């Protein structure tokens, strides 16, 4: 059998097996610094509740910290299909501070965007399981939820935050909890009487190091290459009818940027990045006489049908010169994550990368907005002429039009992820470029 192939060697094979460098069937493993992982609970300052601001200071139990998991215990105020990642919506603002300097700040909407772009098939399902009710649970069900953080030191051990090296400066996590969480204490805008307040706890996973490496971490200077999220809110320009509006949005970014991601949403309904329609999963009661297109199917606010999107085309312009020729929204929703990430992004969330592998940490290409005087994102909208209530029209139309319900999406959220350097020495840390 196999020897009949083994002897089948010709001149063309010299490129593959001549004077080998690698033997596949004798692998060598690296010996590593001994460490142990421990999950330790932190103490929260401030009253826990909807709309409240709380904070916690990370105790030095270990040498390095990596994963941070925030948990909430919630009671659902409605029946099945009335919530959408309620733990993610609740975790409205989280920011990382080291010694008084803000390092990064994430929003509930960024977490859904991240999920829309970079978490893969079973990982994002698991993420949903940790953040929503996915088993058709009924009103009154209680569930414990986990929302992991994605700061620069949260996903990979290589950037673990060295509290051991920060002997003189505190590291804190500030939280603001949403005042309205769909299906938990509000249904749309209507309060749910008797809704319970959340129980909140923050866990940090500590790394304990062996003797020789802890000494080095504590004494020597370190250069950490870290990522930051830049954000400010914008307004949409979604047309009324008969026209495709243009909108030139001025960008407020600095630093070497890996990518720009953005979405359009209804600020009242978390996760509603597209227009609503009287088709399955696209609005409350869709498909029967009770269907209404001004209220989403809250358990299923995300879709993959870009037909309900608001964005027709976009381009990124730098100092008045187009960085690339105009592309349609379907490019930014489906082709960019295919080329740069390898997963599926639902309709209404758009990505353009400057990097070959923005999903990873090893730098692979950046746009440095500290050297670009005027960078803009130019949008073209779809014409909002489709009657959302008529499946014949919703599922049967062209590229340049969208639903009349598209005009409900009023918030334009443009995100940028950049590189920076966290310098740690003398027991204190801070940014190289502030």
């Amino acid at each position: 059998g196999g020897l009949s192939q083994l002897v089948a060697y010709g001149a063309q094979d010299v490129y593959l097996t001549g004077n080998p460098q690698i033997t596949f069937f004798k692998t060598v493993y690296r010996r590593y610094t001994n460490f142990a992982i421990e999950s330790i609970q932190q103490t929260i300052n401030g009253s826990v509740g909807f709309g409240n601001k709380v904070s916690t200071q990370i105790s030095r139990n270990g040498d390095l910290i990596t994963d941070i998991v925030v948990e909430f215990v919630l009671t659902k105020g409605g029946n099945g299909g009335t919530t959408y990642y309620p733990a993610e919506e609740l975790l409205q603002d989280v920011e990382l501070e080291i010694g008084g300097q803000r390092i990064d700040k994430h929003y509930n909407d960024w977490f859904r965007t991240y999920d829309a772009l970079f978490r893969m098939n079973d990982d994002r399902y698991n993420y949903r399981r940790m953040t929503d009710w996915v088993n058709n649970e009924l009103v009154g069900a209680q569930k414990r939820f986990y929302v992991p953080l994605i700061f620069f030191f949260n996903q990979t051990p290589g950037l673990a935050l060295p509290l051991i090296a920060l002997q003189y400066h505190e590291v804190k996590l500030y939280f603001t909890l949403a005042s309205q969480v769909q299906g938990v204490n509000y249904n749309g805008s209507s309060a749910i009487a008797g809704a319970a307040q959340p129980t909140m706890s923050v866990w940090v996973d500590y790394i304990f190091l062996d003797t020789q490496e802890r000494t080095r971490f504590a004494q020597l200077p370190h250069e950490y290459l870290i990522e930051q999220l830049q954000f400010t809110g914008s307004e949409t320009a979604t047309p009324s009818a008969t026209t495709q509006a243009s909108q030139n949005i001025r960008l407020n970014f600095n630093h070497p940027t890996k990518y720009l991601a953005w979405n359009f949403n209804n600020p009242t309904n978390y996760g509603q990045y597209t227009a609503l329609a009287n088709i399955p999963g696209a609005c409350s009661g869709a498909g029967t006489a009770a269907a209404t297109v001004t209220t989403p199917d809250y358990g299923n606010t995300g879709t993959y049908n870009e037909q309900l999107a608001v964005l027709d085309s976009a381009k990124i312009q730098l100092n008045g010169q187009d960085r690339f020729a105009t592309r349609k929204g379907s490019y930014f929703n489906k082709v960019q994550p295919y080329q740069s990430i390898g997963g599926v992004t639902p309709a209404g969330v758009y990505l353009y990368s400057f990097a070959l592998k923005p999903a990873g940490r090893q730098p692979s290409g950046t746009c440095n907005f500290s050297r670009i005087d005027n960078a803009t994102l130019s949008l073209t909208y779809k014409t909002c002429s489709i009657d959302a209530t008529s499946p014949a029209a919703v599922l049967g139309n062209t590229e340049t039009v969208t639903a009349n319900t598209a005009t409900l999406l009023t918030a334009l959220n443009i995100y940028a992820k950049n590189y920076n350097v966290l310098r740690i020495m003398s027991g204190m840390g801070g940014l190289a470029y502030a």
């Binding site: 051991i164 002997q167 003189y168 504590a218 004494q219 200077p221 020495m425 003398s426 027991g427 204190m428």
Partner: peptide, 22 residues
């Protein structure tokens, strides 16, 4: 000992456990 080294570009640290006190 697990305290920060002497040579650095960041000068304002206050070494503890070696103070005259009041």
């Amino acid at each position: 000992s697990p305290e920060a080294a002497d040579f650095a570009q960041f000068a304002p640290k206050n070494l503890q456990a070696q103070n005259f006190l009041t």
